[PDB]
Design a binder for this molecule. Structure first.
Ligand SMILES: Cc1ncc(C)n2nc(CCc3nc(N4CCCCC4)nn3C)nc12
Ligand SMILES: [Mg+2]
Ligand SMILES: [Zn+2]
Length: 312
């Protein structure tokens, strides 16, 4: 049968946590199939259905600066790297479901936060009172799965099908960063008082949620020039939201105010110390082979520190 392969530099570097999927859009589908095949098997999905699913996913990501199809594949590659470095901790269904969850987790994003949708009074804010976009991303996922010829899970039993859609739902909900803080506190306490138990399904759910936040934030674990150029995309969204807040007659939070461009370095430090470093610290405690992500994050924190000192 038909193995996907990549050029030698990609074949080798795609295994590393810091891999960048590159600017050739047309190679991102192949890169994802490559990853499904190695981390899950050539048997997990019928190729024709998988290809048709990937392409409908791509079509339902929008041309926004950050929350775009390149982000989805980037977040799926980080998950691939976690899965491959922790071969024996994850079930068959988890292997299948998590790469799919990652590819789908920001489906049909408009470049605006839950909070902007609530203040604008967007219809999605009435359908979904909390984790507004993330309930929408899971909804878009089920929609695409149900198109003719797109059911990549057709081979699964009714109960295996239900379990996988449940892993995907929880994995996508967990990418609401408002839920990450309490999730990481629970996991931190469970790990420290030795109560953490991976046969406990509600513990697995929390560990997978933390993997999700880690994959979602992985731009902070890249080579500095990647980290830095991705940060421009991230702010290009925030600042457009800030402009839209001002159009509603509301002073945006400083993160979203393009007039406070100068405070970005310090905003990055707060974010590394309050979100990223703690994320990868707890992740590394729970799955030791994920340490390169903590080590990369820490290197990028010291690059942002150099920027503030005017050495960068
Ligand atoms: C790298 C990355 N990945 C994912 C996400 C969700 N984020 N979010 C940020 C924003 C970090 C931030 N900047 C600022 N300001 C406060 C003063 C004014 C100017 C700057 N505040 N904070 C928290 N960076 C990321
Ligand atoms: Mg999201
Ligand atoms: Zn995301």
């Amino acid at each position: 049968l038909m193995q996907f392969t990549l050029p030698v530099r990609l074949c080798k570097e795609i295994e590393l946590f810091h891999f960048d999927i590159g600017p050739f859009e047309n190679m991102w589908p192949g890169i994802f199939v490559y990853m499904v095949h190695r981390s899950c098997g050539t048997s997990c999905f019928e190729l024709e259905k998988l290809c048709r699913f990937i392409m409908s996913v791509k079509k339902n990501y929008r041309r926004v600066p950050y929350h775009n199809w390149k982000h989805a594949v980037t977040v799926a590659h980080c998950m691939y790297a976690i899965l491959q470095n922790n071969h024996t901790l994850f079930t068959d269904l988890e292997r299948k479901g998590l790469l799919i969850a990652c590819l789908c987790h920001d489906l049909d994003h408009r470049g605006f936060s839950n909070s902007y949708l609530q203040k604008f009074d967007h219809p999605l804010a009435a359908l979904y009172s909390t984790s507004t976009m993330e309930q929408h991303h899971f909804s878009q996922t089920v929609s695409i799965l149900q198109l003719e010829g797109h059911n990549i899970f057709s081979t699964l039993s009714s109960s295996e099908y239900e379990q996988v859609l449940e892993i995907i739902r929880k994995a996508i909900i967990a990418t609401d960063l408002a839920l990450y803080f309490g999730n990481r506190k629970q996991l931190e306490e469970m790990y420290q008082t030795g109560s953490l138990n991976l046969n406990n399904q509600s513990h697995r759910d929390r560990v997978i949620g933390l993997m999700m936040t880690a994959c979602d934030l992985c731009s902070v674990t890249k080579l500095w020039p990647v980290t830095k150029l991705t940060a421009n995309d991230i702010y290009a969204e925030f600042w457009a939201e800030g402009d839209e807040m001002k159009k509603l007659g509301i002073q945006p939070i400083p993160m979203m105010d393009r007039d406070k461009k100068d405070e970005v370095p310090q905003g990055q430090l707060g974010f590394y110390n309050a979100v990223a470093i703690p994320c990868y610290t707890t992740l590394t405690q729970i799955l030791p082979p994920t340490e390169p992500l903590l080590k990369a994050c820490r290197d990028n924190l010291s690059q942002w520190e150099k920027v503030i000192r005017g050495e960068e």
